[PDB]
Design a protein around this ligand. Structure first.
Ligand SMILES: C[S@@H](CCCN)C[C@H]1O[C@@H](n2cnc3c(N)ncnc32)[C@H](O)[C@@H]1O
Ligand SMILES: C[S@@H](CCCN)C[C@H]1O[C@@H](n2cnc3c(N)ncnc32)[C@H](O)[C@@H]1O
Ligand SMILES: Nc1nccc2ccccc12
Ligand SMILES: Nc1nccc2ccccc12
Lengths: 293, 293
């Protein structure tokens, strides 16, 4: 999908990844619509009568809106770092909008974070059109690279990172191999012994089979535990998205915060996450419970 | 007020000024019913067979039930309210013409009778024709189903009649308008026994937080000792979640922790969403919505 999804004054998120349905947002003004070296990227201002603000899509899939971006950025950044006893070195694969990095960089334990995203235009357009999301990209604790995540992890030493956050687009497109076992084996390797990873873990309404397959192979590759956390995101298909939160060490329970954010100075700045939302996120509907046991 | 025009060009588009600038849309395979009733515009369609949704019902343009995800809200409102009551014998459902909450209520062996009053007789008839797995309890001998305005019904009902009242309404635009108002809740307080519980269709935290907070305030001021909002995951409500205000008439009641766990009941394994972990988790709210309680 590309430009054709902006039609009759609406962006219509039709995709064969979710046949028969489409979330639609009304378009006030298209700001940017262009092929990049890897994806089709569309940025528009939504109807000022509604709350969504600026919207970004990649290959026809809504990625961020001003209104709800905080949810997924806070969940991935804090569920993973508050599960880690001292997260000092962090990798973000994908993430070129800067939102997960903004949250990671709230933590005073972080010494460095690498962020590697295949598509340098996402960083550029995020700087221009989403300054509250992309401010973080310039921080000297970060090294921001344009490149493929799979090649990057293949060149990375053993035991490099305390946390890896895999903040990718859906499987159709350049993120395809980042949902595969060979990538996860590398993520396990580049984590330190107390390492934690988490990802963009898709929808229990549309992708339950892929989430089953992934949780299985991630455990089989050698992660000691894998728990899926659900969160409320209106502008992801069916209104929620989840993250598989994976511990390299045994006997770790990522479902209860190890280092609670309320004991951190920035707790009251967050709009979604806290420790009760952390715990609640791992309670799954009975039809999906088997992901977590 | 929308009607027939929302289906055009092969799709149903849920455009509504209750959520400006957004619309969920579903492909239409076949229109089964599409007509004004005495009160509302009722539309029923078979969605795309390549999609998971099945049969869809809308009232005044607003999606009410799909085959795929109807279980969520019907289990959450029925079991979250009944499992918070020490012995729920007499139950009233206002609205609920599809039968889905009633189906769940009648799984409880404590229930002696459940009265259900929906203003629109055509919803019950079409639910019997098009949604048999949702409407399978409307003709149960433990239920009495009446066609009428619930505002009048609660006014006429005597004090101290019900253990639990469940207000399963359409959104405020239309014939449900006064069921989001203070006079109605004064009657629901009055018709509850001293240890009564109610809960409602509590809208979206993303779209309706002003109204939801207004209601929590006046329901407390009316005389309910505690009002706590429970959130749940419903793809086919605007923004993907719906909440319910769960309100205890008496003090000393913690509706957020099940008083009678479903796991001790013979039907817990038949449910597709609800269980005690999910009941505890549903009362965790995102920070921005925390002032509801
Ligand atoms: C936009 S971000 C998701 C929105 C919430 N932050 C997802 C990013 O994943 C990148 N992505 C996709 N495939 C890859 C690969 N192979 N490697 C690195 N980054 C990737 C893609 O360019 C998006 O910017
Ligand atoms: C369809 S049900 C909600 C879908 C999930 N069960 C909402 C019912 O509310 C009824 N409704 C709306 N207004 C009222 C009034 N005023 N009284 C009773 N029932 C009402 C409406 O006719 C629907 O069938
Ligand atoms: N839409 C949306 N919202 C939050 C996170 C996302 C990650 C990947 C694709 C879409 C996303
Ligand atoms: N769409 C939808 N799903 C579950 C419950 C509802 C209640 C009222 C309006 C819509 C609903």
């Amino acid at each position: 999908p590309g430009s054709e999804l902006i039609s009759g004054g609406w962006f219509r998120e039709e995709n064969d990844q979710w046949p028969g349905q489409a979330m639609s947002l009304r378009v006030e003004k298209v700001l940017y619509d262009a092929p990049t070296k890897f994806q089709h990227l569309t940025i528009f201002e939504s109807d000022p009568k509604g709350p969504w603000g600026t919207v970004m899509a990649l290959d026809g899939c809504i990625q961020v809106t001003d209104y709800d971006e905080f949810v997924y950025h806070e969940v991935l950044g804090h569920t993973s770092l508050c599960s880690h006893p001292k997260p000092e070195r962090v990798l973000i694969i994908g993430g070129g909008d800067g939102g997960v990095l903004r949250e990671v960089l709230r933590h005073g334990t972080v010494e460095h974070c690498d962020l590697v995203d295949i598509d340098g235009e996402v960083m550029e357009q995020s700087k221009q059109h989403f300054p509250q999301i992309s401010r973080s990209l310039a921080d000297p604790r970060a090294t921001v690279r344009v490149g493929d995540g799979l090649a990057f992890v293949r060149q990375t030493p053993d035991n490099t990172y305390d946390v890896v956050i895999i903040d990718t687009t859906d499987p159709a497109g350049p993120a395809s191999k980042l949902f595969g076992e060979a990538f996860y084996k590398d993520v396990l390797r580049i984590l330190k012994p107390d390492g934690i990873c988490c990802n963009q873990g898709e929808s229990i309404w549309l992708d339950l089979e892929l989430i089953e397959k992934m949780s299985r192979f991630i455990r089989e590759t050698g992660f000691a535990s894998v728990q899926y956390a659900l969160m409320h995101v209106p502008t992801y298909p069916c209104g929620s998205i989840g993250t598989l939160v994976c511990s390299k060490k045994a006997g770790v329970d990522v479902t209860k915060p190890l280092r609670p954010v309320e004991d951190m100075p920035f707790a009251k700045d967050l709009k979604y996450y806290d420790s009760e939302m952390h715990k609640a996120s791992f309670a799954l509907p009975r039809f999906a419970r088997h992901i977590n046991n």
